[PDB]
Copies of this chain bind each other. A is one copy, B any other.
């Protein structure tokens, strides 16, 4: 890999610079190189990895949605035939998105998840696995769509099981996992009631544990709680 000659510490340093410069593709490439050194990631390093790829795939998903909407409009009655270009370019963006998702999934499988024994790391990686299978599911239309959806579900469910056993209900990783799994239920699994029940129960159980927290922990937990409330407001 092109980062094979760069020191681990230098890749991490450069990922932080790339973040400051809003160079998320570079950030992701640096973090991929750091993962490929083979050592486990610290909390801070896991956050760099996630931020980099979230921002890269986020931009691809937004572009894919713009192009998919144009394509859908082209297939309505009365729309003038304009040739294969809209489909081709949506396919191009889609293939690039799938590539990024496959890259992330590959890092998780080789070998981040299997080396992650502490609950905080294992849950974090399994949440990522669910997230990147969810992004694959968003664009899937073929023979494998059900298996892709089930891969996302399975990863999220394993993360949920660990999180409920091992982490307090206010833990930001537990909260973020539940937020995203709830979105999976609403948007991917056609299960809005499950989505709502999960968001509500997660919010309420967190609320009941806030009394245990420092001011700084309270700030972290309540920020994600508000995202749960925001989704509940959208959905009810």
Residues of A at the B interface (CB closer than 8 Å) are 10, 13-14, 17-18, 20-23, 26, 62-63, 66-67, 70, 82-83, 85-86, 88-89, 92-93
Contact = CB atoms under 8 A, between A and B. Distances in A.
8 contacts: A10-B85, A13-B85, A17-B86, A20-B66, A20-B70, A21-B63, A21-B67, A23-B63
Contacts of A63: 21-23
Q: Is the interface of A mostly helix, strand, loop or mixed?
A: helix
A4 B17 CA distance: 36
A83 B115 CA distance: 31
Given A22-B63, A26-B89, 4 more contacts: A13-B85, A17-B67, A17-B86, A21-B62
Contact of A93 (B23, B92, B93): B23
A89 B20 contact: no
Nearest to A13: B85
A22 B93 CA distance: 12
A70 B13 contact: no
A126 to B, nearest CB: 31
B66 A14 contact: no
Contacts of A66: 20-22
Contact of A18 (B14, B62, B89): B89
A83 B88 CA distance: 45
A77 to B, nearest CB: 22
A85 B14 contact: yes
A61 to B, nearest CB: 11
Nearest to A90: B17
B14 A89 contact: yes
